[PDB]
Each structure stands twice: as structure tokens, then as C-alpha cells.
């Protein structure tokens, strides 16, 4: 544990095989500055404003991925190590701002203890699938080298609606459902 | 203006494996003290680390001994890693972060006092500091001239 006023992570290169699954991010004090869309070869700023005040060449992320892709292959052939087991992720659902009926808001599903970083987080409203108004983050690294990830649902708070965050993962025998309603307390 | 980045070093050369590399810059009193650490992680185990307090790569587990030794034994590889404290950590903090992260100020909103949507984190019963993941937090703030 290193003490500091601030920590910049410049950056984070995650790769998995099989599947050729890559991710490249920058962090500052635990928040994502950007990720590099590896298919579009493009820097994606989490705060659009930051992308208007600073810049980052996405090729730096692409080349980081090429290095770790090569490193992982060598390590896998060199090691006799058994792969780490799948973890069971744990989810929490909370609104972004104070609930005011009729006042637009965002429902946050915070998913932790993710390992490996492959997951499906989706939303349901009154047991009906909800695809519109959904945004999710990259996989954030944790100290124990599991990951977390947040999914967001924009919504109008009303009395009747029941929301579920649904999490599907290799470490779960069955999908986990976390519930929230406007009256509920976290 | 432009973020620079850390260059991970390269191994000399059906089962699911996860690899992770990270370049960490720790700042205290601005850039009066910078501590710089890179971490090479395989299969949930950090196995090689560079730490500017140490000044060379070290094997965190036995698996990392050949790789730490190789990276230390190539003068260009070792000096370029050492230099990243300055070319990445210091440069980013004094350049781009001074236009983005270090200038962000989001004013907080206020049986319950919901103090929400503020940044940065310095601010009978109130839950722990929760991180919204969108560069705000919820739970007398740097964004406020006066404290109702």
C-alpha cells in the first residue's frame, strides 16, 4: 500500500486467451480517463470534455496490446501453471442522484469481484428486457487482480416499476439478479 | 495537452488465461515526490515489478526471475523503464492532467441529506464514500467558496 495524493495509471493493458480479448485504459485516482476502442482504433474519453482539452494517440494502446499478447503467449508455454478459477461476481444497484418521481435519473449497477473479465450485465424493467439507455464501463482493475465494472440505465422514477440488474458469468451457476425500486433503500 | 504512455517490456521468447500490465505513477505534493511502479501480472499473480524506489525489475514470484533478469540486463530496456518516471509520470501530471483531472470541480448537491454528484472526493450517519464511476461521488468542498 503506497501513500500518495494522486495516482495516475498510464496505462492498463489487459489481454485474455482464447478469444483475443484486449482492453487498454488510462486511470487517474480510480476513474477512467479513456479506453482505446481496439477495433475502431480510436480513443474514447469517458468525459467528452477531457477529449476536447487533451489528446491521446490510440496507437499507443494498440501497441501495448501487441506486447502483452506476445508476453501472455510466452508465459503460457513457459509455465505449467493451472489457470485461476472463475470467481462469483457480486452486484449492487443504486441511483446516481436522489430519486424524485418524474425527474430523470440513472440507475447504477456496480459489479465487483469479476474474474476473468468476461461478463454480461443487462437490465430488466418489470421483468422485461431493457436495451435502450444503457451504458457500461471498461473493466476496472482491483487490488486483488479481479475487476469491477459499472452499468448505467437512464430512467424515469415511478412508484410501480421494478428494475433488475442481471449478471451472467462463468463463475455463476445461475445468473444473479439484483433488484431496485423507487421506494427502496441502499 | 498530449498524454504520454508507458511501454511494457517484452518476454524474450484451450485453457483461459488473463494477462495484465499496469504503469502506476504515485504523486505527493504535486510532483515533489513521484514514485513509479510497473506491474506484470499473469493468472492473477503479479510476477514481475519495476519500482523506482528499487531502480530495477524484481521477480515477484519465481516465474518472473528470467524476465526481470533479462529486462535489467539490457541497458536500453532498463534505462528506458527508469526514465518513464520523468517522460510519463511527471510529463502527464504537469501537462495534460493540469488541463483535465486536476482542474475538475463539480459542486455537490444537498428518515436524509443526499450530497451527490461532486468531484473530487475530499468533502448522525452517512454511508461510505461511493464512487459513481462517472467522475462523481456521493456520500465543505473544494468546489465551493462557502459551505446549507
Amino acid at each position, epitope marked *: 500500500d503506497i501513500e500518495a495524493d494522486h495516482v495516475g495509471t498510464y496505462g492498463i493493458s489487459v489481454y485474455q486467451s482464447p478469444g483475443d480479448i484486449g482492453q487498454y485504459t488510462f486511470e487517474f485516482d480510480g476513474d477512467e480517463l479513456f479506453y482505446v476502442d481496439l477495433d475502431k482504433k480510436e480513443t474514447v474519453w469517458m468525459l467528452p470534455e477531457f477529449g476536447q482539452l487533451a489528446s491521446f494517440d490510440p496507437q*499507443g494502446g494498440l*501497441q501495448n496490446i*501487441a506486447v502483452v499478447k506476445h508476453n501472455l503467449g510466452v508465459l503460457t508455454k513457459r509455465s505449467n501453471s493451472t489457470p485461476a478459477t472463475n470467481e462469483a461476481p457480486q452486484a449492487t444497484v443504486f441511483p446516481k442522484s436522489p430519486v424524485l418521481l418524474g425527474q430523470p435519473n440513472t440507475l447504477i449497477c456496480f459489479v465487483d469481484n469479476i474474474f476473468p473479465p468476461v461478463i454480461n450485465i443487462t437490465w430488466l424493467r418489470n421483468s422485461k428486457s431493457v436495451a435502450d439507455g444503457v451504458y457500461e464501463t471498461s473493466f476496472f482493475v482491483n487490488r486483488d487482480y479481479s475487476f469491477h465494472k459499472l452499468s448505467y440505465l437512464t430512467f424515469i422514477p415511478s412508484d410501480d416499476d421494478i428494475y433488475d440488474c442481471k449478471v451472467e458469468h462463468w463463475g455463476l451457476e445461475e445468473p444473479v439478479l439484483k433488484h431496485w425500486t423507487s421506494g427502496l433503500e441502499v | 495537452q498530449v498524454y504520454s504512455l508507458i511501454r511494457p517490456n517484452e518476454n524474450p521468447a484451450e485453457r483461459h488465461f488473463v494477462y495484465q500490465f499496469m504503469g502506476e505513477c504515485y504523486f505527493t505534493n504535486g510532483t515533489q515526490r513521484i514514485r513509479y511502479v510497473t506491474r506484470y501480472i499473469y493468472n492473477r499473480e503479479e510476477y514481475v515489478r519495476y519500482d523506482s524506489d528499487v531502480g530495477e525489475h524484481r521477480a515477484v514470484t519465481e516465474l518472473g526471475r528470467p524476465d526481470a533478469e533479462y529486462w535489467n540486463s539490457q541497458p536500453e*530496456i532498463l534505462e528506458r523503464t527508469r526514465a518513464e518516471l520523468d517522460t510519463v509520470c511527471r510529463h502527464n501530471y504537469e501537462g495534460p492532467e493540469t488541463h483535465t483531472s486536476l482542474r475538475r470541480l463539480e459542486q455537490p448537491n444537498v428518515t436524509v441529506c443526499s450530497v451527490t454528484d461532486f468531484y473530487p472526493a475530499k468533502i448522525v450517519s452517512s454511508t461510505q464514500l461511493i464512487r459513481n464511476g462517472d467522475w462523481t461521488f456521493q456520500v465543505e468542498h473544494p468546489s465551493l467558496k462557502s459551505p446549507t
Partner: T-cell receptor, first 113, second 114 residues
């Protein structure tokens, strides 16, 4: 913009006289600075590098100082030899993108024996 | 000894035609293969660094359209099309990503002939 500007030339010197090829650079990053040399009929090749600000590098009697305050990397040799006839390129690299080289336009030198 | 071979060494390119260049890495310990162009005024300019087999990328510069491919660990390719101005294409290699010593290959010289 990150860029390198060097003497236009062409330069012609008598053998045994001194050479100065000026090089300015512009970047907000922390560059590593280089000279490359290209002899007639060959591709470019590294002459020397300097990664630390205010340090000197040198090779084959050439030298250059990474002058941070003047953002300069001027090439000097006290006593040119006929075999130094070549094109000299100032270049920088920054830790960004593909860590690629950005080259000055090059300065041709002819040394009369 | 030399680390790189480039085929062809010279080519005349009729307008509306494309040409295919190869760069052969003779020593796999220098796997970071790049393309640089040098124009008719001797200006050098990086085009591509492609580490992994299967990598492909396109880039359009004044005077030429480029398609680069890393075909194997020892084989880098370049297709040059819509070439309105001659140039020289250098393959380079280094032991690490952006290594301090870029080794320049023998070069492919392209000319448009009307």
C-alpha cells in the same frame, strides 16, 4: 505539433575543418534525440542518441548536446574527413503512438579531400 | 550481417496500377518491423509499425495510398496504389517496440512513369 528543423544545406567543407549542423526541435513531450547518417548508396543508420536532457552523445568524432532550454541538438565535429560525405538527419522520438521517429529534412554534407 | 531484405529493389509504376512490396526479416530477434517512406526531397516519414501476424492497416499520404500487412513473424508487406509521385519505401526493424536502433533495410525505389 512535434517537429524537427535542421540546416537546409547542402554543406561543403574542406577536409579537416569543423562542422556544425544546426537542429531545433519542438514538442511539449520529453523527447529522445538522435542523429542518423546516410552514406551514398545506403539506407539511413543511427549515428548516436541522447535520451537525457542536457546530456551529450557522440560517435565517429561527431557530438551533439541535448540543450533543453534552447531546444537544440546541434551536430558538431572538429575535423571532418572525406568519408563523412553523407546526409545527416536530426530526429526525435516521443513516448506516444508507435514510439516512431520524427525526422528533420536532412542536411547533405560533402567533404572535399 | 544484414537483418532485412526488400523485394523489389526498383519498380516503375504506371498510373492506375498498384505494386506489392515485401520485407523479409532475416533474424527473428528484431520482430518490430516498420515502414518509413522517403520522398523525392529526402524527407523521411513513418508509415506503419505492425507487430503481429494478421495485422493490417491502410493509410493515405499525399502521393500514395498504402495497405500494410504483417503476414508472419518474419514477413512484412506493403501495397502502394494511386501513386502520383515517386518515393522510396524503407523497411526497418528493432529488437523492441520503438527501439533506439532502427535498422533500415535496403529500400524499394518507386517511380511513376507516364
Amino acid at each position: 505539433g512535434d517537429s524537427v528543423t535542421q540546416t537546409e544545406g547542402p554543406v561543403t567543407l574542406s577536409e579537416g575543418t569543423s562542422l556544425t549542423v544546426n537542429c531545433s526541435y519542438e514538442t511539449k513531450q520529453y523527447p529522445t534525440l538522435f542523429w542518423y547518417v546516410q552514406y551514398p548508396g545506403e539506407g539511413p543508420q543511427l549515428l548516436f542518441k541522447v535520451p537525457k536532457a542536457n546530456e551529450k552523445g557522440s560517435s565517429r568524432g561527431f557530438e551533439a548536446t541535448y540543450n533543453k532550454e534552447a531546444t537544440s541538438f546541434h551536430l558538431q565535429k572538429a575535423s571532418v574527413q572525406e568519408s563523412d560525405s553523407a546526409v545527416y538527419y536530426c530526429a526525435l522520438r516521443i513516448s506516444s503512438g508507435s514510439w516512431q521517429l520524427i525526422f528533420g529534412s536532412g542536411t547533405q554534407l560533402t567533404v572535399m579531400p | 550481417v544484414t537483418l532485412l531484405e526488400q523485394n523489389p529493389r526498383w519498380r516503375l509504376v504506371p498510373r492506375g496500377q498498384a505494386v506489392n512490396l515485401r520485407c523479409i526479416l532475416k533474424n527473428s530477434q528484431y520482430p518490430w518491423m516498420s515502414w518509413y517512406q522517403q520522398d523525392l526531397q529526402k524527407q523521411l516519414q513513418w508509415l506503419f509499425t505492425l507487430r503481429s501476424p494478421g495485422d493490417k492497416e491502410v493509410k493515405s499520404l499525399p502521393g500514395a495510398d498504402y495497405l500494410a500487412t504483417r503476414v508472419t513473424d518474419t514477413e512484412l508487406r506493403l501495397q502502394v496504389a494511386n501513386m502520383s509521385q515517386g518515393r522510396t519505401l524503407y523497411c526497418t526493424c528493432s529488437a523492441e517496440l520503438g527501439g533506439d536502433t532502427q535498422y533500415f533495410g535496403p529500400g524499394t525505389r518507386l517511380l511513376v512513369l507516364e
